[PDB]
């Protein structure tokens, strides 16, 4: 276990500082294209939904003391189709319980591309309409999905994401779930950067595990 200190870089394609953050909502892609799965094995894998660009990473131990970068998490890949495209260096799962029956689970994966690649995925953005009076208004995800090209650079640290509203009782989580069009989403530590791209050189601290 470590306590990573990420330094967000300039927004990835097609996001930009003066626009909303696009996220790969569905679990499929147009013909001849594939999603970016984060697969521990064939049965278990989370479909990457949010993408962000990380410039540099500083690792501090639990008591915040100097340390060196860890070895890549063995057994975890970032598969596009059947070929590996990155290594996972730090995992974390911010479990948030909406109610007794509904629990949100945001999983943050910090990866480091081995070979650059580009895929086309259906994108969408978190939104929250205005409300009258003071009634609670939900942070949903748009329904229409805009096909857009995504680009990754070899050797560049990236921070992925996957949010699954796991209904019912559950113990870690490998439940892969789409971004539902009308399910209200709660904001936790793993979704703060998935509203608008943060300014470059901003240091967002986390506490990331190195295993399952």
């Amino acid at each position, epitope marked *: 276990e470590y306590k990573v200190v990420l330094t967000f870089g300039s927004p990835m394609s097609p996001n930009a500082n003066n626009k909303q953050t696009w996220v790969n909502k569905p679990l499929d892609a147009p013909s001849g294209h594939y999603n970016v799965k984060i697969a521990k094995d064939v049965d278990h894998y989370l479909t990457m939904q949010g993408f962000t660009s990380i410039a540099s990473v500083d690792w501090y131990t639990i008591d915040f003391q100097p340390s060196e970068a860890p*070895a*890549p998490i*063995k057994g975890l*890949q970032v598969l596009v189709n059947i070929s590996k495209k990155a290594d996972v260096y730090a995992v974390k799962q911010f479990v948030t319980a909406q109610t007794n029956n509904k629990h949100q689970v945001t999983s943050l994966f910090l990866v480091k591309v081995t*070979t650059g690649f580009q895929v086309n995925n259906y994108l969408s953005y978190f939104y929250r309409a205005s409300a009258t009076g003071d009634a609670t208004t939900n942070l949903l995800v748009r329904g229409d999905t805009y096909t857009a090209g995504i680009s990754f650079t070899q050797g560049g640290w990236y921070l992925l994401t996957n949010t699954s509203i796991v209904d019912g009782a559950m113990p870690w989580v490998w439940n892969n779930v789409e971004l539902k069009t009308n399910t209200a989403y709660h904001m936790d530590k793993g979704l703060v950067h998935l509203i608008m791209p943060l300014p470059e050189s901003t240091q967002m601290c986390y506490e990331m595990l190195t295993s399952i």
Partner: antibody
Amino acid sequence: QVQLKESGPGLVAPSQSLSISCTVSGFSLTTFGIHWIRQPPGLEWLGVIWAAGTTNYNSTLKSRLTITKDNSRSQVFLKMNSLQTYDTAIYYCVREDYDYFFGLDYWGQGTSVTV
Amino acid sequence: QAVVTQESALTTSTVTLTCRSSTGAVTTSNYASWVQEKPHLFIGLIGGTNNRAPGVPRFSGSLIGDKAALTITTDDEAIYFCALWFSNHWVFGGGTKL
């Protein structure tokens, strides 16, 4: 049919630099990390670069060990500073999968770096 | 970041080799890998304590007691080495000159 091969100086003087190039073949450096091990006349984990380009050195040996790899040229280099008299051994570069095997499978023949 | 101890030698004409560690945790994290040796060719035999490298025959890893072990159910004379991932690296044992 995955091979390996390291070119080593084969002779060095103390306080000099050790330049050993461990070439690869039959696979790619974008998937498997290359481990750097030594066998002084057990086996010492010297250092490793992973496929994604980060590396890790023996704590006691982080000052002197530097690992660099050339992806397209399929080459790996090891450079030792402050070389001492006790650093005589055959240095091994092992390809580690850390994808489906979590271990060492193929080892280079090795090069006697004598000091 | 501890030490690892392995049997100095063994003799046979089924045999098992045990790789104990000073911590003694014998966790699956060790990802024990038994790379063998030949008159100085090191090869990959097992990985993760239960897998196998391509082309390897009889060999089978297991977690016996609190000390990772190997199994060989005349051409196998080798100085088998045991490696156990500590958190960031490998720690080879002495090896067994079977």
